[PDB]
Design a protein around this ligand. Structure first.
Ligand code: BNG
Ligand code: 218
Length: 178
């Protein structure tokens, strides 16, 4: 967990997440597949909770200071661009330090982290985005559909990519000095 290498990986994955976040990802309206979560999920899985949290923090800051965040208020910004991307760090609780690498924990951490992130967007949807609720939908129903569907699709893409990495590059997930 040597500091320079550790800090470098953190910076690298936050930057990567930011850069991937520049790829168009809209399916319909605010229904998206947030492939940009993946670098942070990988960072968390490999390096653990704290690193993941910090990587998420950095990515969220980047989103906002480069003008790519959609901000409606300070509270909403804090929730959706600090709390939400930080919360991806929870994948770090499912880190595996010892080989052989198992698939299940990678999927569990991913599922839990994407769920938690989209849980905060869901809340945010109720509070701040209800004006956009499709005709005839109430605020909770709209937010669940929107953020529920985005969360699932996002978990799908994370699953696909991370499953390829587990089969191809299992070592991405296991940190070692040496
Ligand atoms: C106005 C506040 C901005 C300054 C406070 C710290 C900025 C957060 C990012 O820090 C570093 O910045 C590099 C370029 O910004 C990133 O590429 C790198 O990943 C990151 O580690
Ligand atoms: C109903 C609804 N619409 C929009 C948003 C905003 N939102 C949703 C998902 C992810 C993100 C972060 C950038 O990908 C944002 C800002 C919402 N929460 N709910």
């Amino acid at each position: 967990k040597f500091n320079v290498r550790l800090l470098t990986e953190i910076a690298f994955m936050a930057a990567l997440a930011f850069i991937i976040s520049l790829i168009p990802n809209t399916v319909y309206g605010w229904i998206i597949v947030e492939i940009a979560c993946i670098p942070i999920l990988l960072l968390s899985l490999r390096r653990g909770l704290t690193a993941g949290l910090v990587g998420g923090l950095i990515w969220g800051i980047l989103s906002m200071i480069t003008g790519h965040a959609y901000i409606l208020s300070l509270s909403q910004a804090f929730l959706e661009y600090l709390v939400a991307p930080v919360s991806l760090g929870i994948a770090g609780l499912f880190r595996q330090k010892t080989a052989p690498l198992k698939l299940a924990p990678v999927l569990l951490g991913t599922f839990v982290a994407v769920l938690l992130k989209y849980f905060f967007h869901f809340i945010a949807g109720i509070i701040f985005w209800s004006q956009y609720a499709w005709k005839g939908w109430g605020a909770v129903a709209y937010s669940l559909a929107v953020n529920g569907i985005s969360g699932i699709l996002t978990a799908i893409a994370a699953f696909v990519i991370l499953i390829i990495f587990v089969k191809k590059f299992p070592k991405l997930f296991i940190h070692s000095n040496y």
